[PDB]
Coordinates of all heavy atoms in Angstrom, one line a residue:
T71 N 0.8 -1.2 0.0 CA 0.0 0.0 0.0 C 0.9 1.2 0.0 O 0.6 2.2 -0.8 CB -1.0 0.1 1.2 OG1 -0.2 -0.2 2.4 CG2 -2.0 -1.0 1.1
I72 N 1.9 1.2 0.9 CA 2.8 2.3 1.0 C 3.5 2.6 -0.3 O 3.6 3.8 -0.7 CB 4.0 2.2 2.1 CG1 3.8 1.2 3.2 CG2 4.2 3.6 2.7 CD1 5.1 0.9 3.8
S73 N 4.0 1.5 -0.9 CA 4.7 1.6 -2.2 C 3.8 2.2 -3.3 O 4.2 3.1 -4.0 CB 5.1 0.2 -2.7 OG 4.1 -0.6 -3.3
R74 N 2.5 1.8 -3.3 CA 1.5 2.3 -4.2 C 1.4 3.8 -4.0 O 1.3 4.6 -5.0 CB 0.2 1.5 -4.1 CG 0.4 0.1 -4.8 CD -0.9 -0.8 -4.6 NE -0.5 -2.2 -4.6 CZ -1.3 -3.2 -4.7 NH1 -2.7 -3.0 -4.7 NH2 -0.9 -4.5 -4.7
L75 N 1.2 4.2 -2.8 CA 1.1 5.6 -2.4 C 2.2 6.4 -2.9 O 2.0 7.5 -3.5 CB 1.1 5.8 -0.9 CG 0.3 5.1 0.2 CD1 0.4 5.8 1.5 CD2 -1.1 4.9 -0.2
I76 N 3.4 5.9 -2.7 CA 4.7 6.5 -3.1 C 4.7 6.8 -4.6 O 5.0 7.9 -5.1 CB 6.0 5.9 -2.6 CG1 6.0 6.0 -1.1 CG2 7.2 6.5 -3.2 CD1 6.8 4.9 -0.4
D77 N 4.3 5.7 -5.3 CA 4.2 5.7 -6.8 C 3.3 6.8 -7.3 O 3.6 7.6 -8.2 CB 3.8 4.4 -7.4 CG 4.9 3.4 -7.6 OD1 6.1 3.8 -7.8 OD2 4.7 2.2 -7.6
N78 N 2.1 6.9 -6.6 CA 1.0 7.8 -7.1 C 1.4 9.2 -7.2 O 1.1 9.8 -8.2 CB -0.3 7.6 -6.3 CG -1.0 6.3 -6.6 OD1 -0.4 5.3 -7.1 ND2 -2.3 6.3 -6.4
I79 N 2.1 9.7 -6.1 CA 2.4 11.2 -5.9 C 2.6 12.0 -7.2 O 3.4 11.5 -8.1 CB 3.6 11.4 -5.0 CG1 3.4 10.8 -3.6 CG2 4.0 12.9 -4.9 CD1 4.7 10.3 -3.0
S80 N 2.0 13.2 -7.3 CA 2.3 14.1 -8.5 C 2.2 15.6 -8.1 O 1.8 16.4 -9.0 CB 1.3 13.7 -9.6 OG 1.5 12.4 -10.1
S81 N 2.5 16.0 -6.9 CA 2.5 17.4 -6.4 C 3.3 17.6 -5.1 O 3.5 16.6 -4.4 CB 1.1 17.9 -6.3 OG 1.1 19.3 -6.2
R82 N 3.6 18.8 -4.8 CA 4.4 19.0 -3.5 C 3.6 18.8 -2.3 O 4.1 18.1 -1.4 CB 5.0 20.4 -3.5 CG 6.0 20.6 -2.3 CD 7.4 21.1 -2.8 NE 7.5 22.6 -2.6 CZ 7.2 23.5 -3.6 NH1 6.9 23.2 -4.8 NH2 7.4 24.8 -3.3
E83 N 2.3 19.1 -2.3 CA 1.3 18.7 -1.3 C 1.3 17.2 -1.2 O 1.3 16.7 -0.1 CB -0.1 19.3 -1.6 CG -0.2 20.8 -1.6 CD -1.6 21.3 -1.8 OE1 -2.4 20.6 -2.5 OE2 -2.0 22.4 -1.3
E84 N 1.2 16.6 -2.3 CA 1.1 15.1 -2.4 C 2.4 14.5 -1.7 O 2.3 13.5 -0.9 CB 0.9 14.6 -3.8 CG -0.5 15.0 -4.3 CD -1.1 14.0 -5.3 OE1 -0.4 13.1 -5.8 OE2 -2.4 14.1 -5.5
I85 N 3.5 15.1 -2.1 CA 4.8 14.6 -1.5 C 4.8 14.7 0.0 O 5.2 13.8 0.7 CB 6.0 15.4 -2.1 CG1 6.3 15.1 -3.6 CG2 7.3 15.1 -1.3 CD1 7.1 16.1 -4.3
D86 N 4.3 15.9 0.5 CA 4.2 16.2 1.9 C 3.4 15.1 2.6 O 3.8 14.5 3.7 CB 3.5 17.5 2.1 CG 4.3 18.5 3.0 OD1 5.6 18.3 3.1 OD2 3.7 19.5 3.4
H87 N 2.2 14.8 2.0 CA 1.3 13.8 2.5 C 2.0 12.4 2.6 O 1.8 11.7 3.6 CB 0.0 13.7 1.6 CG -1.0 14.8 1.8 ND1 -1.6 15.0 3.0 CD2 -1.5 15.7 1.0 CE1 -2.4 16.0 3.0 NE2 -2.4 16.5 1.7
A88 N 2.7 12.1 1.5 CA 3.4 10.8 1.4 C 4.4 10.7 2.6 O 4.5 9.7 3.1 CB 4.1 10.7 0.1
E89 N 5.1 11.8 2.8 CA 6.1 11.9 3.9 C 5.5 11.5 5.2 O 6.0 10.7 6.0 CB 6.8 13.3 4.0 CG 8.2 13.3 4.6 CD 8.5 14.6 5.4 OE1 7.5 15.2 6.0 OE2 9.7 14.9 5.6
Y90 N 4.4 12.2 5.5 CA 3.6 12.0 6.7 C 3.2 10.5 6.8 O 3.3 9.9 7.9 CB 2.3 12.8 6.5 CG 1.7 13.6 7.7 CD1 2.5 14.5 8.4 CD2 0.3 13.6 7.9 CE1 2.0 15.3 9.4 CE2 -0.2 14.4 8.9 CZ 0.6 15.3 9.7 OH 0.1 16.1 10.6
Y91 N 2.7 10.0 5.7 CA 2.3 8.6 5.7 C 3.4 7.6 6.0 O 3.3 6.7 6.8 CB 1.5 8.3 4.4 CG 0.1 8.7 4.6 CD1 -0.3 9.9 5.2 CD2 -1.0 7.8 4.2 CE1 -1.6 10.3 5.4 CE2 -2.3 8.2 4.4 CZ -2.6 9.4 5.0 OH -3.9 9.7 5.3
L92 N 4.6 7.9 5.5 CA 5.8 7.2 5.7 C 6.2 7.2 7.2 O 6.5 6.1 7.8 CB 7.0 7.7 4.9 CG 7.2 7.2 3.4 CD1 8.3 8.0 2.7 CD2 7.5 5.7 3.4
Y93 N 6.1 8.3 7.7 CA 6.4 8.6 9.2 C 5.5 7.7 10.0 O 5.9 7.0 11.0 CB 6.3 10.1 9.5 CG 6.0 10.6 10.9 CD1 7.0 11.2 11.7 CD2 4.7 10.6 11.3 CE1 6.7 11.7 12.9 CE2 4.3 11.1 12.6 CZ 5.3 11.7 13.4 OH 5.0 12.2 14.6
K94 N 4.2 7.7 9.7 CA 3.1 7.0 10.4 C 3.5 5.5 10.3 O 3.4 4.8 11.4 CB 1.8 7.3 9.7 CG 1.2 8.7 10.0 CD 0.4 8.8 11.3 CE -0.2 10.1 11.4 NZ -1.0 10.3 12.7
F95 N 3.8 5.0 9.2 CA 4.2 3.6 8.9 C 5.3 3.2 9.8 O 5.3 2.2 10.4 CB 4.6 3.4 7.5 CG 4.9 1.9 7.2 CD1 3.8 1.0 7.1 CD2 6.2 1.5 7.0 CE1 4.1 -0.3 6.8 CE2 6.5 0.2 6.7 CZ 5.4 -0.7 6.6
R96 N 6.3 4.1 9.8 CA 7.5 3.9 10.7 C 7.1 3.7 12.1 O 7.6 2.8 12.8 CB 8.6 5.0 10.5 CG 9.8 4.9 11.3 CD 10.5 3.5 11.2 NE 12.0 3.7 11.3 CZ 12.9 2.8 10.9 NH1 12.5 1.7 10.2 NH2 14.2 3.0 11.1

């Protein structure tokens, strides 16, 4: 799921969101 999320990103807001998600996962 995380991988998919990472793949999807296409904006700086999106990147930020992904970062947050990654942190959460960690």
Side-chain angles (χ1 to χ4, degrees):
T71 51
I72 340 161
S73 80
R74 287 173 206 190
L75 313 191
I76 295 157
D77 274 334
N78 283 29
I79 299 150
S80 302
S81 194
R82 193 128 94 265
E83 293 185 330
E84 296 211 343
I85 291 164
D86 236 19
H87 280 299
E89 205 216 24
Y90 223 46
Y91 276 44
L92 273 173
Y93 154 108
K94 289 273 185 182
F95 182 74
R96 179 51 149 202

